[PDB]
Amino acid sequence: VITVDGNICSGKGRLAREIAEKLGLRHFPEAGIHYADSTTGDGKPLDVQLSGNCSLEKFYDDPKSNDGNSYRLQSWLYASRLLQYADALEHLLSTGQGVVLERSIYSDFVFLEAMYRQGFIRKQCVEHYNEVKKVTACEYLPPHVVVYVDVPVPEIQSRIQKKGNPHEMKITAAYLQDIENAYKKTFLPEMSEKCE
Amino acid sequence: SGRPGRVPLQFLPNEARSLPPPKLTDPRLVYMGFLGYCSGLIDNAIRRRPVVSAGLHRQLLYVTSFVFFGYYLLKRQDYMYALRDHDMFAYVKSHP
Amino acid sequence: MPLVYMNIIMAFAIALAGLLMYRSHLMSSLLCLEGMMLSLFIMSTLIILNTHFTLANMMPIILLVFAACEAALGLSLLVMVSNTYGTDYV
Amino acid sequence: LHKYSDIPEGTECHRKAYASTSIGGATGLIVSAYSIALKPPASFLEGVARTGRYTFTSAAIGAIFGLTSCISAQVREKPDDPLNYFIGGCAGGLTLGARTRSYGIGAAACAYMGLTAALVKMGQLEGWQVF
């Protein structure tokens, strides 16, 4: 299975488009708040209130909300993306066909890695996140078969301006730069050794 | 156990048989019925299910199951008690 | 009962007390247990030799087998505990 | 215990008191034994300090219990009713109260040890089988 690791705003979408065309297996659709709802039975998104009770737009509009949404989204997304793995890796063990994931769990290290730096989330939120990380991820053994990628921070800032959504435009730069910095500094630095 | 005569693993002696069988609607027995019934119901409720109306099939399986085993178990019951009563009286003649 | 039997039995009692005083790395315990095994063996065989209760000549060896067998198992567990530490009961 | 059992009645208080002292000493050695077994004292001298503690305490309790009981028997000269032990029972706790240097534990020990002893005597009178 192949999970492209495009790391940007509007460039995130660009990464997905290249990946979808690239692989025969169905492309990851992002698997965000209603990603579970897609598989649930109705196959359809619910209200945000119970399906996730996080809402990303309410992250970007007021990051560092007194309500810990800044974290509540993070961890919720991680659980969903974990399920993503399960939705597709099982299919890998079934039909034996390749299948194309969009972003995958190893990539979720970094958003929190920066949010902690901008201070959007308190440290204990992090400690919870890495205990649950260690407890859950460790048993999943094989990773990879997937392509890392890069885009300039400023250039993504440029496409971000081009991008229609207001919330995306608001997003801060220094945060995103901290993302790309830690992301390249550690994520590829460890994972490539396994993918090799 | 260890009583003279008799053989080990047979569930029920031919020496029984002579005792009347429990009648079909002995209340104890029907209670085995409902016992199976409720078990059959919890079988639904645990596995979500729309309780009662669903799987009325299997529910019937359970009630027939436990009433069935309950029957023979009742036979061995009466056999055993009749047995101790018999041994007791024989012994009271044995040592007047 | 002739004194010799008493002596072997006592060797058993020591072969137990040694198992239970139980100290440091546990490999000593698998030893002490096997010693215990050996004392039971000998104490059995002397008896079967005594009364010429011939069929039971088969038992001691069979005893030995399983007993040795479990001890043979025991080392394996020790391996695992040795595997993460370099063994100690402590 | 069979030795202690042949009181008789309460005659010769010393003869009895020595036996009760013996029983108290025995139980003290047992409690000390498991205590050392399950609470590794560290530095063995402390361990014998511990066992000296418990042994002496339980022996004391047995002594004082025995002699107060027999004295009450030889004074009230009732002498067979269960209450005859109960004082000693109540006394015993106080002994335990002294070593612990606490009014609380001594107070509770008085009451419960008293009731236990009273039940024991009552049992000798009634042949209660326990086992």
Binding site: - | - | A17, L20, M21, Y22, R23 | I30, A33, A37, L38, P40
Partner: protein
């Protein structure tokens, strides 16, 4: 000063709920001593055999 308070809210409750409820605190922390080192209770098996 008495009846509502010390006689029935503070002693009459001390004498048998709080007693047992405390004694089980002590005993329960004593028996379940958290540790679990082998040499300990294993040696205890020894002496309990010697007594038995």
């Amino acid at each position: 000063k008495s009846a509502s308070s010390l006689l029935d809210l503070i002693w009459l409750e001390t004498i048998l709920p709080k007693t047992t409820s405390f004694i089980q605190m002590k005993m329960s922390i004593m028996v379940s001593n958290q540790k679990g080192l082998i040499k300990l209770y294993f040696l205890s098996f020894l002496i309990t055999i010697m007594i038995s």
